[model samples]
Target: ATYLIGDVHGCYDELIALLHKVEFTPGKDTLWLTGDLVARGPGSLDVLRYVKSLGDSVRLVLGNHDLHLLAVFAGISRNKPKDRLTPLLEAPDADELLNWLRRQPLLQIDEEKKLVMAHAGITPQWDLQTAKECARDVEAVLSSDSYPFFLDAMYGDMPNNWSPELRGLGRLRFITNAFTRMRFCFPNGQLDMYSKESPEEAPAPLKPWFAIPGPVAEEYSIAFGHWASLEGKGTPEGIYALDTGCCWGGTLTCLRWEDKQYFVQPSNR
Candidate 1:
């Protein structure tokens, strides 16, 4: 079975309980994380270790909080006291864990299954192939020796929009932000990077990315988890909003790809 779970946000116990609820078998079942695996809870380190223990059975994209952790690791940003990531940072195997995280892509697709998973929804302007190509470009940088350069260059919303002609770090930043931090976007593909409200609460012209007419939402099965306010709702039948705000006292949810069965663990908070 292939189980795809929502943003964990370091809710380790909830994750374990969800897995058990699904009757997960390590070597027999595959686990896909929609990202945001750490931060905002008490067990960030334990969560990382447990997920790493899954080996080849697991695949994940990097969420905004995950990238923020990387930025802090790179000395480009300060570690926030609220994040509770210090123990992970100071762990003896911190380098190993961080290095493993750095290699994770911003997107994961099982073309054979017609499935695409990103931390956040893909930009409306990109078709399936274009989105894959853009993802590969950033993946290369994240996995390469020059990763530090990009990590430090990773901040900003300036090109709060996407363009085919976007080049260098600007392009990378835009792609990273789109796949990791995006929520609401203008119909024209201009991202409302600072918006934190739900779709109904958002100011005019901003709609949840999946609600917009986009190639990912319109043409293929795409699952994402970032805006918890959506509360596991998605439209057009193919888009799955997996985050149920586990970090904010909601449930940790998982969906079986083949049967679309949902398994959830109530928040411990």
Candidate 2:
């Protein structure tokens, strides 16, 4: 059996209970996380430890906060009191966990199921193959020794658009942001990074990324987190909006791939 859950965001107890709620067997069943595994919740360190211990049973992609954590760990950015990640930053095994974290992919694909998972969602401009190639571009550098340099460069909302001819870090920046931070985008696929309203409340010319046409939605199902305001609603068929803002007093939801059954655990916040 395969189970997919939204942003854990350090809600370790909820994650544990949710797994129990679903009768998840670590080695026998696969667990999928939409990332943002740390920050904002009470047990970031425990979340990392437990997820790491789960080994191959889990599949995860890096979220924006998760990337920020890496930057902070690499001294490219500073820890925030809001995130409460300093303890995890100071943990004794911080390096080991961070090392493992950097190796996490930006995308996970299940070809047979036609399901794709990313931290946020893939760009509407790229097809499935292009999305995978773009993910590989960022993944390779993050897992490399020179990741700190890229992490430092990974910040900022640049260009705010995508094009096949895009070059250098700018290209990687748009790809990273599209996969981790996007919400509304222009019809031309230009990202509007600051939008927070749900579909009904958002201003004109800013449709949710999945609302636009793209292979991830047109051809395959895309499971993503990041935008907690949706509360797991607002998407059409083939789009799974998982992040229920558990860190902000909402429920932690999990989806069963085989049956599309949602198992939820109330937030401990």
Q: Which candidate has the top score in lDDT?
A: 2
- Give TM-scores for every candidate, taking all chains together and pairing residue i with residue i: 0.96, 0.98
Per residue, candidate 2 scores C-alpha lDDT tens digits across 1-269 of: 99999999899999999999999998789999999999999899999998888889999899999999999999999888999898899999999999999999999999898899998888898888789889999999999999999998888889797888999989989989988998888988889988887877898988988888986688889999999988889899999999999999999999999999999999977
Model 1 agreement with the true structure over 189-245: per-residue lDDT tens digits: 788889877777889888888777887767678889988988886455788889999
Any residue pairs clashing in model 2, and if so which?
A: none
Worst 10 residues of 2 by lDDT: 210-219
- TM-score for predicted model 1 compared with the true structure: 0.96
Per TM-score, the best of the predicted structures is 2
- The lDDT for every candidate, in the order shown, is 0.87, 0.91
Name the lDDT of candidate 2.
0.91
Clashes of 2: 0
